[PDB]
Amino acid sequence: EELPWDELDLG
């Protein structure tokens, strides 16, 4: 369950 980014789109 990884994400393409880290703090690029968190809401």
Curated annotation (Swiss-Prot):
Q: In which tissues is it expressed?
A: Expressed in vestibule of the inner ear, eye and small intestine.
Where, subcellularly, is it found? Answer: Cytoplasm, Cytosol; Cytoplasm, Cytoskeleton; Cell membrane; Cell projection, Cilium
Described purpose of this protein according to its UniProt entry: Plays a role in pre-mRNA splicing by regulating the release and transfer of U4/U6.U5 tri-small nuclear ribonucleoprotein (tri-snRNP) complexes from their assembly site in Cajal bodies to nuclear speckles, thereby contributing to the assembly of the pre-catalytic spliceosome on target pre-mRNAs. May also participate in recycling of snRNPs back to Cajal bodies during splicing. Plays a role in regulating MAGI2-mediated endocytosis.
How does this chain assemble?
Answer: Part of a complex composed of USH1C, USH1G and MYO7A. Interacts with USH1C (via the first PDZ domain). Interacts with PDZD7. Interacts with CDH23 and PCDH15; these interactions may recruit USH1G to the plasma membrane. Interacts with intraflagellar transport proteins IFT20, IFT52 and IFT57. Interacts with splicing factors SF3B1, PRPF6, PRPF31 and SON. Interacts with the U4/U6.U5 tri-small nuclear ribonucleoprotein (tri-snRNP) complex in the presence of pre-mRNAs.
Q: Which disease is it linked to?
A: Usher syndrome 1G: USH is a genetically heterogeneous condition characterized by the association of retinitis pigmentosa with sensorineural deafness. Age at onset and differences in auditory and vestibular function distinguish Usher syndrome type 1 (USH1), Usher syndrome type 2 (USH2) and Usher syndrome type 3 (USH3). USH1 is characterized by profound congenital sensorineural deafness, absent vestibular function and prepubertal onset of progressive retinitis pigmentosa leading to blindness. The first cases with non-syndromic sensorineural hearing loss based on mutations in USH1G. The hearing loss has an onset during early childhood, is progressive, and has a downsloping audiogram configuration. Ophthalmic and vestibular abnormalities are absent.
Tell me what this protein is called: pre-mRNA splicing regulator USH1G
Q: Where does this protein come from, organism-wise?
A: Homo sapiens (Human)
Please state which portion of the whole protein this structure contains, as first and last residue out of the total length: 370 to 380 of 461
